[PDB]
Structures are given as C-alpha cells and as structure tokens.
Design an enzyme around this catalytic site. Structure first.
Site, PDB file in Angstrom:
ATOM      1  N   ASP A 230       0.450   1.879   7.406  1.00  0.00           N
ATOM      2  CA  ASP A 230       0.127   0.780   6.667  1.00  0.00           C
ATOM      3  C   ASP A 230      -1.346   0.622   6.271  1.00  0.00           C
ATOM      4  OD1 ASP A 230       0.378  -1.457   4.927  1.00  0.00           O
ATOM      5  OD2 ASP A 230       0.353  -2.787   6.726  1.00  0.00           O
TER       6      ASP A 230
ATOM      7  N   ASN B 209       0.160   6.989   2.975  1.00  0.00           N
ATOM      8  CA  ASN B 209       0.793   6.113   3.997  1.00  0.00           C
ATOM      9  C   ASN B 209       2.042   6.740   4.467  1.00  0.00           C
ATOM     10  OD1 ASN B 209      -0.201   2.727   3.506  1.00  0.00           O
ATOM     11  ND2 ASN B 209      -1.200   4.423   2.943  1.00  0.00           N
TER      12      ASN B 209
ATOM     13  N   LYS C 231       1.989   4.508  -0.904  1.00  0.00           N
ATOM     14  CA  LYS C 231       1.113   5.719  -1.467  1.00  0.00           C
ATOM     15  C   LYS C 231       1.418   6.902  -0.703  1.00  0.00           C
ATOM     16  CE  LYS C 231      -3.209   4.217   0.174  1.00  0.00           C
ATOM     17  NZ  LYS C 231      -4.203   3.304   0.072  1.00  0.00           N
TER      18      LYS C 231
ATOM     19  N   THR D 149      -6.642   2.500  -4.044  1.00  0.00           N
ATOM     20  CA  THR D 149      -6.383   3.277  -5.223  1.00  0.00           C
ATOM     21  C   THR D 149      -5.151   2.517  -6.169  1.00  0.00           C
ATOM     22  OG1 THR D 149      -6.451   5.251  -3.375  1.00  0.00           O
ATOM     23  CG2 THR D 149      -5.356   5.908  -5.618  1.00  0.00           C
TER      24      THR D 149
ATOM     25  N   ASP E 281       0.992  -1.052   0.132  1.00  0.00           N
ATOM     26  CA  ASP E 281      -0.074   0.003  -0.083  1.00  0.00           C
ATOM     27  C   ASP E 281       0.914   1.183  -0.034  1.00  0.00           C
ATOM     28  OD1 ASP E 281      -2.922  -0.809   0.546  1.00  0.00           O
ATOM     29  OD2 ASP E 281      -1.307  -2.101   1.984  1.00  0.00           O
TER      30      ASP E 281
END
Ligand SMILES: COCc1cccc(CC(=O)Nc2ccc(-c3cn[nH]c3)cc2)c1
Ligand SMILES: COCc1cccc(CC(=O)Nc2ccc(-c3cn[nH]c3)cc2)c1
Ligand SMILES: [Cl-]
Ligand SMILES: [Cl-]
Ligand SMILES: [Cl-]
Lengths: 373, 379
Positions: free
Chosen positions: B209, B196, B193, B218, B191
C-alpha cells in the site's frame, strides 16, 4: 536477539524501573501538558501531535488515578509546598492520608526533587515501622501521595500530653530503631528524624513518615560543616532524652545558645537532680549523644538492639509489634482526627505556571512519580 | 480495579496508541528533540536529559534498530526513501525493508501518509496483503520490515509478457479478493496500481500500500470522484478502488492506460470525460465480456460495478472459467511461477545502487513528534 523482548518486558513491569508502564505514561502525559498552549500549537508538528493524541490522552487520564477519585474529609497537615488531607476513596470508601505537593511552588522555588526519597522510602520499605504509600499520582498542578492513615497522631502531641516513663520510652525508641534500620537498609539517610515524623497507628504502634534542619535535634558534625547514618542516631538520642526528661538536652532561649550547647555536648549534656532515670537509659542516651567517630549506630543496628536498655520482660525484638502499646487511641470512626489539630480546607484558586510562549518543560521534573500498589 | 485492567489492556494491545512501543517512542522522541545545547540552558530540560540518559541509551540498544540488518540490495526507490532487500544478522532471514526519510517528510510537509500503509500491512492477517513484521525508527528514518515478494510487481510482468485473457482473469480476480480483504478491515486502498501488486514465491498476488502529481502520485488510475475530492468537491467510498481495477484490466489487455495523455492536465480531463474518452483500439482482440467488465468499472460511481458489493463483481461473466473457483483461486498454479536461484534473487526487480539532516534548533521544534507511535513488533 529473542531475549531482548523479555529484558524489555521486565523493565516495563519492574515497579522500581525508570521505564515501567507508569513512567512511560507519565512522559506522554507530561508531553501533552507541556505542549498544549496556544502559542505552541502554531507549530504544525505540535498541533498535529496533540490532535492525534487527544482522544487517547483524555481516555488515559480518566482511567488512571486522579484527585477526583477521592473525597476530602479534613485537612490534617499544611506546609510550604502543600498539605496533607484525610481522604475517602469514592468507590471503595476506604479512608487514607493524602499529601499534595504544589508543582507551581516547587518550580517557582527551583526546589523540585526532594520528594523522590520520600516516595521511594514509603513505597518500597515494606516495613511494619514505615508509613506505607499505596499510590502516587499527579496532574498538571500537583503530586499526590496516598498513604495509610495514622489516627494516633505524632510523638510531638504524645510528649506534650504525657510524662513518659521508661517503660514507654523503651517501647517508642525500640520502634524508631526498627523504623530507621528499615530505611538505612534501603540505602537512605532520613536526615531529619524528629518526633514530628513519628506517627501512631490505630493500635498505638509507631511508624516513621519521611519528610522535612530543626535546631534541637541537629548533630555537632552538621553545625561544624556549614554524612553517615550516625546523624540519624544522634536524633534518636535527643528523642530518648526528651521523652525521659521532658526537655531537649541542649535547650536554650536562642538559636546560638542551642548550637553552642550542641558543640559543647561533652559538658552541656546533664541529667536533672530531680529525675530517676536508670543507668542503662543514661548509657544509651550518652552512646548516641557523642562524637560521630565513637557514636552508637556506626556499625549498624545489631549493636543498638543488644543494648541493655532494651532488656525487658514484656517484649522481644520479634514480638515488639505484637505487644499492647502504651497509648492506644479510642477512635469514634474511620475519620476520627481527634489526635490532630483540624485545619481548614483552602478552596481558593491557586496561581499556576506562566503560560509558555515556547516549550519550557514544567512537567519534566515529575515524570516517573506515578506509582500503583 | 476494572480501570487498572482496562489500562493494562491498552498497554499490551498491538492496535492501541498507548501500548508499550508507542510510550517508548514518546520518550525516545522527547530525548532526541530536547538534546541540543541551546535547549539545555533550560534547567528542566537539562535535568530531564541527565536523569534519562542511561535508560534511553539502554532502551535504544535493546529495541530493534537498523544495525540488526545487513543490506543486500536496493530494490525500490522513491521521493521519501527506498526499499532494500535485507538479511537479519541474527536469524539470517531475508526481508524487504522500506526506509522513509524523516528529513524529507518534514521538508515536503508530508509526514502522515504512512499510517494506513503500516496498519493495513500489520493487521490485515490475510494471504492477499503483504505482511509487516516489524516497524521501528531512529532520529533519521522510519523502517518497515515486510515479507519479501520475489516475483516482483505487475509493472515488471506486463513489460516482460503479452498478457492473455486467461492471465488477466487470474490477476484481476486476485486483486478483487485482495481489495475485498482491505475493504472488510474498514480501509480504502486509494493507491490501486500495478506497482502495488506484488507476486510471492508461488506467483500469487498480494497488495502492498503506497503512492508513487504532489498529493495523488500517478494519476492514470485515479477515479473521477477521488480527483474531484481534492479541492473539497465531494467525497468517495470504497468503490474508488473498483475504478482502479477497471484501469488495470484495460492496461493488461490493451498495453496502455485508458486515459493516457502527455500532460497531467490531459489525463485529468480524459478521466472526467470518461464517457467519451474511453475507447478500445480498432485492432480489438479483446472479448465482449472483458470489454463489458472494463466498462462496468470505468463509469460513474453511482452506477459502477463495485456498488452493491463484491458478489456482483464475482458473478460477472468475464470470471467464468474451468481452471479455478473463487474459493480455490489461491490454491491453483499461478500463470508465472518464479524460478529463484537463491533467497537473495532479485531478478524480478530493476537494478538500483547526500543525506541531509535537520538543522540544530534554537528552540524546541518537535521534528520527532509526527512519528511517535510508529514502532510495532509482531511477536
Ligand atoms: C514542606 O511542604 C510539604 C508538606 C506539606 C504538608 C505537610 C508536610 C509535612 C508532612 O508530610 N506531614 C505529614 C505526613 C504524613 C502524615 C500521615 C500519614 N498517614 N497519616 C498521617 C501526616 C502529616 C510537608
Ligand atoms: C514516495 O514515498 C514512499 C515510497 C518511498 C520509497 C519507495 C516507495 C515504493 C515502494 O514502497 N515500493 C515497494 C514496496 C514494497 C516492496 C516489497 C515488499 N516485499 N517485497 C518487496 C517493494 C517495493 C514508496
Ligand atoms: Cl494571536
Ligand atoms: Cl509488614
Ligand atoms: Cl498489636
């Protein structure tokens, strides 16, 4: 707000707590046994929980005490809800008596709560006069109670093999008095004190076991009620009389005859012409075999201990357990059961609970039974 | 004897599924799931509840609960819950608390995504990962108490600033070190991105996370192999996180994601066609080494810069500079150091303001079962 963590930690370590480690593991173990059925695993929440906890529950069952840890040497007792075996721990090689209670029979007969007092009394009495429970454990089918083996057998066996003189009766009665006091101090009432519950160790000293009333030993206050510590003390008087006379005080051929002799105790209680029982032995028997309102035992044990029947030259209350017992068993080995009727092992597959279609919780009445010494 | 000690270890080990907190969760879940009138018609159930009534009420009070915290602000909101800025009523310390709705997780058949999030934050013990101090629950929610990151996220930073290459080098390098710390624990972030990437009181990066499509969230940052992996097309390694780093570096320097499209299908197809879809705009003020790093990450996993290890990424020319060294990167002054008015300053977060419950069961359903073992206490 920091003290909460310490308070919780205390509850997890206290052997008498309902949320200690063994109880909490019992809940998880019971939950897995009660959910793991094909029709229940059609529910995604249940099926996923079992898959997630599969490895850890299998590991826990293997580490925790289980029936496989013991080898069955002999069966020394059998009842409606199970049996008592002489077992040997496979690893330590120590011999014990192990009682098994059938969860199926207890659930089938809506009778699944009598064992709590039995467990607690033997686990926590911490008494020279109470049979000790070292371990209690369970699987989906049985409860198990590992107790110290009492190779001398019971007082029923002793009374049939011997004519009991007063010196012996004083010794056995005094040990029963201390055994009942230890149980009463914990807040319990034995309810079925009888020679069947009185067991003798390797030295011939008496300890009470607690289990399951019987007609000959039943007090009048019970026969007129269809209680206090007094109902237990009535049973001690019956026991002392049976030891000294050879017969129960209110014996009759029928159930009804015994009940009427018990109610009519003021006139039915007699000592035979052919008996040389002392004045103090008759006084102690009569002090127990009387109405609840005036019975010896109402006020506590100190009154019973001060009774003249217990005055002797051999022992004092503090050195009673140190004296040589009247019947010392000669044991050939650690698995000698000569003082018990050997029974056969029943190896046949036993019927289990009906397979649930929905969650029924058959393991729930037994959560918290596990105990490690 | 060794079995007795091994059992005792399992009950105290914070990583164990049978530790005291997990065993109390089981009893707690059982009481919540059985205590309904139609279920108490069963004598075994009714008796169990009556026998455990006092102890379960006492346990719930001693254990950590939502009541122990005061809600100051809401700094995040999602499909399955929200993130609040809270203050512990007793110690008066401020924390970030994530709430996950049990009802929504059971309703969307999505009740197991939080396990890796919980474990990474609880056990990373890294300056690069947001720390989870406590994890607890009630019949309605999951609660994750984390350290507050007052600098906000990289989404916020990229909208407030035009990111020069000096800053992009700093943030990319911190993400590289944070991902290496997660990979060393045996995890795949999956994840990665800017949502995060959070900044602490010093302006340094820590990874949180979580996901923000139905299963991948996404898609702009999703690698071709993790996109394929859905619908059983192969598998992916830790190198899927290195692709996401390439997307992040491109977004920082260009202002847009490399495979942006109006629809999810368009993005999915641009990602798979990366060899032809990946382009840099005509107005190219990006260095040769920055384009080389982006292209080395935005390629097939078989030849991707993440393959062979992190040392290969660290030796890349884009990271050659005078300000810091890899071993002293978290000791240098960050490009944006937040000016905080108070312990309740949420200026680096956007301003945020009918709770449906489970129906009464006719038979045991076990709605609390997916959440047994979530509770975690740090001290
Ligand atoms: C009613 O159903 C339960 C049931 C099943 C079996 C037997 C019984 C009666 C019973 O508890 N006897 C018993 C108990 C202890 C010992 C012993 C302990 N250490 N050495 C010896 C010996 C005998 C009850
Ligand atoms: C969609 O389901 C998962 C879900 C539900 C709600 C919200 C979110 C998004 C979310 O976790 N953001 C987030 C995470 C951490 C912090 C933080 C940590 N320390 N200080 C601040 C701040 C925000 C996801
Ligand atoms: Cl079927
Ligand atoms: Cl002792
Ligand atoms: Cl002795």
């Amino acid at each position: 707000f920091e003290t909460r963590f310490e308070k919780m930690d205390n509850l997890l370590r206290d052997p008498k707590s309902e949320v200690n480690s063994d109880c909490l593991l019992d809940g998880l173990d019971a939950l897995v046994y009660d959910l793991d059925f094909p029709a229940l695993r059609k529910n995604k929440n249940i099926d996923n929980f079992l898959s997630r906890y599969k490895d850890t529950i299998n590991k826990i069952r293997d580490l925790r005490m289980k029936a496989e840890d013991y080898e069955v040497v002999k069966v020394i007792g059998r009842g409606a809800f199970g049996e008592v075996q002489l077992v040997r721990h496979k690893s330590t090689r120590k011999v014990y008596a192990m009682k098994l209670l059938s969860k199926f029979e207890m659930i089938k007969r809506s009778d699944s709560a009598f064992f709590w007092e039995e467990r607690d009394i033997m686990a926590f009495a911490n008494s020279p006069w109470v049979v000790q429970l070292f371990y209690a454990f369970q699987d989906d089918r049985y409860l198990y109670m590992v107790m110290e083996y009492m190779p001398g057998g019971d007082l029923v066996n002793l009374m049939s093999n011997y004519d009991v003189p007063e010196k012996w009766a004083r010794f056995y009665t005094a040990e029963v008095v201390l055994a009942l006091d230890a149980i009463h101090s914990m807040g319990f009432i034995h309810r079925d004190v009888k020679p069947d519950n009185m067991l003798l160790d390797k030295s011939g000293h008496l300890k009470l076991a607690d289990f399951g009333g019987t007609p000959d030993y039943i007090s009048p206050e019970v026969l007129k009620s269809q209680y206090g510590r007094e109902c237990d003390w009535w049973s001690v008087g019956v026991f002392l009389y049976e030891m000294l006379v050879g017969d129960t005080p209110f014996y009759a051929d029928s159930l009804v005859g015994t009940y009427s002799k018990i109610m009519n105790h003021k006139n039915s209680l007699t000592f035979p012409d052919d008996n040389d029982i002392s004045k103090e032995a008759k006084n102690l028997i009569c002090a127990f075999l009387t109405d609840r309102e005036v019975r010896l035992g109402r006020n506590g044990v100190e009154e019973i201990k001060r009774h003249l029947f217990f005055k002797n030259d051999q022992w004092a209350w503090e050195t009673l357990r140190d004296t040589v017992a009247p019947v010392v068993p000669d044991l050939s080995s650690d698995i000698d059961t000569s003082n018990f009727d050997d029974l056969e092992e029943d190896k046949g597959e036993e019927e289990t609970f009906p397979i649930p279609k929905a969650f029924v919780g058959n393991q729930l009445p037994f959560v918290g039974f596990t105990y490690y010494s």
